[PDB]
DNA sequence: GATAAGTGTAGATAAGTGTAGATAAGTGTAGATAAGTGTAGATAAGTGTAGATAAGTGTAGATAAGTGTAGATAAGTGTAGATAAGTGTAGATAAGTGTAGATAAGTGTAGATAAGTGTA
C-alpha cells in the first residue's frame, strides 16, 4: 500500500469519483479493503500467499 | 668642496598681418513647359421597398432528478484490569579546588657598533 509507504509508491483503494469526500465509515472500509488485499484474505495467515506472491 | 641645473642676454630665421589683383560664388531678370484648379458627362456606390424562409417564444406531455422515511451495521464513548514509564533514595568513583616546589618568562643594567646630523 501507498498509504503506509512514505514515497507514495504502491497501490491504494479509493473512491471512484475524484470529487467525492469519503465518509467516516467509507475511509475505514477502504482501509479494510487495502488490508484484505495485502493479506489476500480476511485474517492474517503466514501460510497464505501475500499479494506480492500472488502477483508474481 | 666640485659640478652643472637655472636664469639673463644677444643675434638669425620665419611665423603673423596688411595690401593688391584675378576668377567665379551669389543675386536679379526673361522666357518655356507643365503642375494645379474649375468644369462637364458616365457608371455604379448607397438607400428605400416588397416578398420568402426559419430564428424565437409559448404550450403540452414523459421520464427521472430531488427529498422524506424506515431499518441494519459499526463508528464513538465509558468502564475495568495489566505492565512499565516516572520519581525518590542509597552507595562508589573521580570531577573540581586549594596547596607546595622547580624552571624560565619578564625587566633592569653595562658596553660595542653604526644611523643620524652638521659641515666643507
From TrEMBL:
This is Portal protein. It comes from Staphylococcus phage 812. The lineage of its organism: Viruses, Duplodnaviria, Heunggongvirae, Uroviricota, Caudoviricetes.
Amino acid at each position: 500500500p501507498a498509504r503506509y509507504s512514505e514515497k507514495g509508491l504502491g497501490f491504494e483503494v479509493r473512491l471512484r469519483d475524484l470529487d467525492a469526500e469519503p465518509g467516516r465509515k467509507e475511509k475505514e472500509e477502504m482501509k479494510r479493503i487495502e488490508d484484505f488485499i495485502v493479506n489476500t484474505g480476511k485474517d492474517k495467515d503466514v501460510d497464505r500467499d501475500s499479494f506480492q506472491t500472488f502477483c508474481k
